[PDB]
Design a protein around this nucleic acid. Structure first.
Ligand SMILES: [Mg+2]
Ligand SMILES: [Mg+2]
Ligand SMILES: [Mg+2]
Ligand SMILES: [Mg+2]
Ligand SMILES: [Mg+2]
Ligand SMILES: [Mg+2]
Ligand SMILES: [Mg+2]
Ligand SMILES: [Mg+2]
Lengths: 338, 63, 51, 132, 220
RNA sequence: AUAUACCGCCAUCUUCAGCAAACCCUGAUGAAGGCUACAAAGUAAGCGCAAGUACCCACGUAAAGACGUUAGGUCAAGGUGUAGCCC
């Protein structure tokens, strides 16, 4: 019967069942366009109506109602099938997504530069990296086990400016937008020795996460936890070692790493603080000292005590490595370039 | 943009660092005035803390 | 691997511009194979060519 | 909860026209009827015939102008003249619009034995009354 | 135009005191205004110990010696900002002096916010006022404590937004985040009047000097 | 056959005023939280309520009543996915 016919929108609504009791709590098909591959005035009988589906005027005169031959209509049908197949293939193809720390993990995936600011500010120089994605839930009075996405993103320009932000949203893309927009307003500046590494060894314990970062020479690479590698790439650090101990909660690690890197003291700051030259001894350069930093104010005449035995607390792991007793099979493995 | 990390460094330090990094395209109106006439104490944040042991406020009685 | 995926990259001792990309500029040590992903055959060819 | 001809709220992403936005209980309050004829008045006959004709006219115009209809038709009857006032989109070419108008006029006239005038009002895009 | 703007802006920065604000106040004037009276020893905040001259019968005495230098620096900075035509916003939740501060701001051609400070008025300004709104270039706290004696949230908001803050810090106030803290009494009408008069005079001097310098150069 | 795939029309709290995208802030940047008017971080477009409308007032009765809960009902209004019979 004709009078029971409905519209494509209502039919797809009924078919796909996009809404329903199941979808509320997650207790397969997708929409298709059945009007794209049609030209108004084309039917199975292959009639050619002047002015609608064939040009109205031919030889400067109105064309007549025509009909394609049987074989010509079959040719048109084959062409339509071919166009349908081409569209189907263009839908079948998939994006060759670059994978992060693992094929199905968001960590390390790049979200691109943060959106331009309301005042026209542009952060095209910046890059955003996802460090974590949690599907946090929370029981509600009526909605029950609500689902939300907690995202952590680090934004950096590879020139010492880098920050991180948490993102809460029901939609993953919304969380990405929120986090990568909120991070740019929370940028730190990380001082880099020679623009490739930290200025000194950093030992810290943020909450229950211990971070031990060792300054390293040029070309040593990033031998660090993967999140630390991502954050170092964002900052602009190329050579550094880093060991994480205790709880390795990603947010705790990120916050502690940024705190330590921000709190590091530059060579110039040390020179000003102690009123003395800062001298660097490079083995490749022999005994030739290199004055890396010198004080701005009056250089002290006091030679500073030459302590016979320091009282600094030593890391047992570092002492063990220096003595060579550490037999860890996993230590100093050959790994891809970082 | 700026750096809303008010607990990290001072406003001057953050602004100077971002300007050096190029994040801030132009210095703020107050930057040069501050640099010329910095305050006696850098406005670095500092969490207050109660004195627990034998430590006491070094405030003398005016007699 | 990088060398085998571009036939035009011929590993010869005169292709110093290509060989310099598999030697650490700061220390002059040939990267071990896992560093660059080069297969063992091409890594041995690269080592011989660099030497 | 009531569901009759109501566009349920969303995150401010779906545009809707006046007709779609306004709910059934607003008929004759903020929105008029889409069809005007004497069938439904007191002591008037052939309301069923008029309703069937209107339903077929809508299902015919929608299919004859696929996607070209911006908003529902407006059917008016005067004596025997039937006026179909439609709001369409400025996408299809004027030649094709005129061909379809003439075809529809002739076919509907010969099918319902009454003169039919099809008036078209073209707009760049679906008129947006509010975002729901 | 570069040379013009340079000689207009950078030139005052070459002088130790380009506006002669030192003439606006003296330690005796502050003492008469009672700038030196603080709260009880119990109400003392830990970070005001360096600025407290001592305690007299469990009442703290703010060292006007330090207050003089701090106020000199703060007034010089305020004058420089006003000369450079930045936006100066006075802030005080003291309902006693709300009207006086509003009148002073309206007279000096600067802005005042003595009312309930709605959240996000600085951090969320681009939404609460329009994306193109311009934020204050300097914030002057005539009272750094809100009406529950906690620090005025505008202090933290200005620190977040990188807006320099001049501020009168009493003995129970927290001066860590105030860019230019002026340790002094903030609860007495005489002290509040002295502060308002000094800031109004500095702003008016800076603006009139700016106009005079602009005219002087453009005449050339 | 499947209302435990749905549209469509509805029961239900509802004789409720809450739901709120987008921002900002607090929690050391954890799940989460954001209330004090002599105000102490909330601002919120939109929806709902409200307002407006019908009946005889401006009253009252209608109507309306968001988001969600009960995989609440309806494959037997009709259509439709899936599966199934096709002498
Ligand atoms: Mg995989
Ligand atoms: Mg006080
Ligand atoms: Mg059901
Ligand atoms: Mg009911
Ligand atoms: Mg009712
Ligand atoms: Mg109502
Ligand atoms: Mg059921
Ligand atoms: Mg049942």
């Amino acid at each position: 019967s004709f009078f029971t016919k409905l519209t494509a929108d209502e039919l797809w609504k009924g078919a796909l069942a996009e809404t329903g009791a199941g979808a509320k709590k997650g207790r397969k098909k997708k929409r298709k366009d059945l009007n794209r591959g049609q030209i108004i005035g084309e039917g199975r009988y292959g009639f050619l109506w002047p002015g609608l589906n064939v040009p109205l005027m031919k030889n400067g005169a109105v064309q007549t109602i025509a009909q394609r031959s049987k074989e010509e209509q079959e040719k048109v049908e084959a062409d339509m099938i071919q166009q349908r197949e081409e569209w189907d293939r263009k839908k079948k193809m998939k994006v060759k997504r670059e994978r992060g720390w693992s094929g199905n993990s968001w960590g390390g995936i790049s979200l691109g530069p943060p959106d331009p600011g309301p005042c026209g500010e542009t952060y095209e120089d910046f890059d955003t990296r996802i460090l974590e994605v949690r599907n946090v839930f929370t029981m509600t009075a009526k909605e029950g086990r609500k689902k939300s996405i907690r995202v952590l993103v680090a934004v950096g320009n590879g020139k010492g400016a880098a920050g991180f932000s948490i993102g809460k949203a029901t939609d993953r893309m919304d969380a990405f937008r929120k986090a990568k927009n909120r991070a740019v307003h929370h940028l730190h500046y990380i001082e880099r020795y020679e623009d490739h590494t930290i200025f000194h060894d950093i030992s810290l314990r943020f909450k229950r996460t211990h971070i031990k970062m060792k300054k390293q020479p040029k070309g040593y690479g990033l031998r660090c936890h993967r999140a630390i590698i991502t954050i170092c790439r964002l900052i602009g650090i190329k050579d550094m070692y880093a060991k994480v101990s205790g709880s390795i909660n990603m947010l705790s690690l990120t916050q502690g790493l940024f705190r330590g890197l921000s709190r590091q003291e530059t060579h110039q700051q040390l020179a000003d603080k102690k009123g003395l030259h800062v001298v660097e001894i490079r083995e490749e350069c022999g005994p030739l000292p290199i004055v890396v930093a010198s004080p701005r104010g009056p250089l002290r005449k006091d030679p500073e005590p030459e302590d016979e035995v320091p009282d600094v607390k030593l890391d047992w792991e570092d002492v063990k490595t220096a003595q060579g007793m550490k037999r860890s099979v996993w230590s100093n493995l050959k790994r891809a370039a970082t | 943009a700026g750096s809303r990390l008010e607990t990290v460094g001072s406003i001057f330090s953050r602004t100077r660092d971002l300007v050096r990094a190029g994040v801030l395209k132009e210095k703020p109106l107050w930057f040069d005035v501050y640099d010329a006439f910095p305050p006696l104490r850098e406005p670095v944040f500092q969490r207050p803390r109660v004195r627990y042991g034998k430590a006491k406020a070094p405030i003398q009685d005016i007699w | 691997c990088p060398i085998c995926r571009d036939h035009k990259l011929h590993v010869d001792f005169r292709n110093v511009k290509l060989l310099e990309q598999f030697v650490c500029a700061h220390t002059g040590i040939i990267f071990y194979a896992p560093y660059t992903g080069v297969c063992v055959k091409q890594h041995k060819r690269l080592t011989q060519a660099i030497q | 909860k009531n569901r009759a001809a109501r566009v349920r709220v969303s995150k401010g992403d779906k545009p809707v026209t006046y007709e779609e936005a306004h709910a059934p209980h607003y008929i004759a309050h903020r929105k008029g009827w889409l069809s005007l004829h004497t069938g439904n008045l007191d002591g008037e006959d052939h309301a069923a015939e008029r309703t069937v004709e209107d339903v077929f006219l809508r299902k015919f115009m929608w299919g004859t102008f696929p996607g070209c209809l911006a908003d529902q038709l407006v059917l008016k009857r005067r004596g025997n003249q039937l006026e179909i006032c439609a709001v369409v989109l400025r996408q299809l070419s004027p030649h094709k619009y005129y061909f379809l108008v003439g075809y529809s006029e002739t076919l509907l006239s010969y099918f319902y034995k009454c003169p039919v005038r099809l008036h078209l009002q073209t707009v760049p895009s679906k008129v947006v009354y509010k975002y729901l | 135009s570069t040379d013009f703007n340079d000689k207009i802006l950078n030139e005052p920065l070459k002088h130790s005191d380009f506006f002669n604000v030192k003439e606006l106040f003296s330690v005796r004037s502050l003492f008469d205004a009672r700038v030196h009276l603080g709260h009880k020893a119990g109400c003392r905040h830990r970070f005001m110990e360096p600025y407290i001259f001592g305690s007299r019968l469990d009442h703290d005495i703010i060292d006007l010696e330090q207050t003089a230098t701090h106020l000199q620096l703060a007034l010089n900075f305020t004058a420089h900002m006003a000369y450079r035509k930045g936006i100066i916003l006075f802030i005080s939740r003291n309902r006693q002096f709300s009207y006086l501060i509003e009148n002073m701001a309206r007279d000096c051609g600067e802005y005042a916010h003595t009312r309930y400070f709605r959240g996000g008025m600085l951090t969320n300004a681009r939404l609460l006022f329009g994306p193109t709104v311009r934020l204050p270039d300097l914030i002057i706290f005539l009272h750094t404590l809100n009406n529950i004696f906690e620090p005025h949230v505008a202090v933290r908001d200005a620190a977040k937004m990188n807006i320099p803050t001049v501020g009168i810090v009493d003995t129970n106030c927290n001066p860590c985040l105030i860019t230019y803290p002026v340790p002094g009494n903030d609860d007495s009408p005489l002290a509040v009047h002295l502060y308002c008069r000094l800031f109004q005079t500095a702003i008016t001097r800076a603006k009139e000097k700016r106009q005079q310098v602009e005219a002087l150069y453009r005449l050339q």
